[PDB]
Design an enzyme around this catalytic site. Structure first.
Site, mmCIF file in Angstrom:
data_model
loop_
_atom_site.group_PDB
_atom_site.id
_atom_site.type_symbol
_atom_site.label_atom_id
_atom_site.label_comp_id
_atom_site.label_asym_id
_atom_site.label_seq_id
_atom_site.Cartn_x
_atom_site.Cartn_y
_atom_site.Cartn_z
ATOM 1 N N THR A 1 0.827 -1.200 0.000
ATOM 2 C CA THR A 1 0.000 0.000 0.000
ATOM 3 C C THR A 1 0.865 1.255 0.000
ATOM 4 O O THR A 1 1.951 1.269 0.578
ATOM 5 C CB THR A 1 -0.910 0.048 1.238
ATOM 6 O OG1 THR A 1 -0.112 0.260 2.408
ATOM 7 C CG2 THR A 1 -1.670 -1.260 1.386
ATOM 8 N N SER A 2 0.379 2.308 -0.647
ATOM 9 C CA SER A 2 1.111 3.564 -0.713
ATOM 10 C C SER A 2 1.529 4.002 0.696
ATOM 11 O O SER A 2 0.750 3.873 1.646
ATOM 12 C CB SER A 2 0.233 4.634 -1.366
ATOM 13 O OG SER A 2 0.928 5.858 -1.492
ATOM 14 N N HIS B 1 9.160 0.613 2.325
ATOM 15 C CA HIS B 1 8.747 -0.651 2.927
ATOM 16 C C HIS B 1 10.002 -1.522 3.012
ATOM 17 O O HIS B 1 10.977 -1.271 2.305
ATOM 18 C CB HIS B 1 7.690 -1.340 2.053
ATOM 19 C CG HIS B 1 6.294 -0.844 2.283
ATOM 20 N ND1 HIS B 1 5.428 -0.553 1.252
ATOM 21 C CD2 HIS B 1 5.601 -0.624 3.427
ATOM 22 C CE1 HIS B 1 4.262 -0.177 1.748
ATOM 23 N NE2 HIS B 1 4.340 -0.213 3.065
ATOM 24 N N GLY B 2 9.980 -2.535 3.874
ATOM 25 C CA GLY B 2 11.128 -3.408 4.009
ATOM 26 C C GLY B 2 10.894 -4.624 4.884
ATOM 27 O O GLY B 2 9.808 -4.821 5.435
ATOM 28 N N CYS C 1 10.087 -1.425 7.680
ATOM 29 C CA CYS C 1 9.811 -2.560 8.528
ATOM 30 C C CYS C 1 10.975 -3.546 8.428
ATOM 31 O O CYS C 1 11.689 -3.575 7.420
ATOM 32 C CB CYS C 1 8.500 -3.225 8.097
ATOM 33 S SG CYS C 1 7.002 -2.235 8.453
#
Lengths: 141, 91, 4
Positions: free
Chosen positions: A29-30, A88-89, A130
């Site tokens: 998600t954005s 993100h990650g 993350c």
């Protein structure tokens, strides 16, 4: 003596990779709100006399290429190096708009033996992402 | 010689294996605190001490709110990984 | 709040 030399001509570069929109394939998600962070960072490091370079929605390929070219620059006149990653990650991984990329692959470009102009100079990597899916419920105090 | 892995500082927003939280309007908890602690102490504290302030702020002043119990009332503690060999001052 |  016990402090890094921070009086070179230039404080150094501050590369900010701000990934907000990810390809549907990634299924992420954005990252709404990251623009606020990127702008906050820009202004914060600008006051710290850093040459800020902002980049948006970069693919894994572009992230690696960017880092590669940056490590190849001549940092002789710079006191240090800063890189901020907003995306993100997962554990040891950072996401490009189109997919993940090992954080190690990015940092290696700056190893004391692969970037001689930064040898002995502080290389800072700020990671907002993350590192897994564990939830901390905390404890009352 | 010096190790090729020396002089690196990795300022992670969350502990290994955990989620990192972000406010859709105010930005991620970590980045907001970092910029605020840098603005307030970058001219008086060494970087490790600044990042410690960031750890305390994120850890004590933030708690998630969500209509999804799974992501509601959660906490976060940043992770400072330092391979630095000297103290760092931004002034 | 949204996770990263």
């Amino acid at each position: 003596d016990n402090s890094y030399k921070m009086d070179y001509p230039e404080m150094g570069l501050c590369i900010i990779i701000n990934n907000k929109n990810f390809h549907k394939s990634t299924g992420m998600t954005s990252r709404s709100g990251t623009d606020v962070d990127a702008a906050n960072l820009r202004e914060t490091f600008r006051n710290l006399k850093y040459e800020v370079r902002n980049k948006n929605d970069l693919t894994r390929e572009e992230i690696v290429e960017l880092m590669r070219d940056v490590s190849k620059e001549d940092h002789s006149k710079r006191s240090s190096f800063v890189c901020v990653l907003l995306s993100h990650g997962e554990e040891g991984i950072i996401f490009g708009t189109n997919g993940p990329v090992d954080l190690k692959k990015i940092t290696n470009f700056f190893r004391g033996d692969r970037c001689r102009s930064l040898t002995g100079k502080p290389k800072l990597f700020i990671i907002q992402a993350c590192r897994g899916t564990e939830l901390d419920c905390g404890i009352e105090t | 010689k010096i190790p090729v892995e020396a002089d690196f500082l990795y300022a992670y927003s969350t502990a290994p294996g955990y989620y990192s939280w972000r406010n859709s309007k105010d930005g991620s908890w970590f980045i907001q605190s970092l910029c605020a602690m840098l603005k307030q102490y970058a001219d008086k504290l060494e970087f490790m001490h600044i990042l410690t302030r960031v750890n305390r702020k994120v850890a004590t002043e933030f708690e998630s709110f969500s209509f999804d119990a799974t992501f509601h009332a959660k906490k976060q503690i940043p992770c400072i990984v330092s391979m630095l060999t000297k103290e760092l001052y931004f002034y | 709040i949204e996770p990263d």
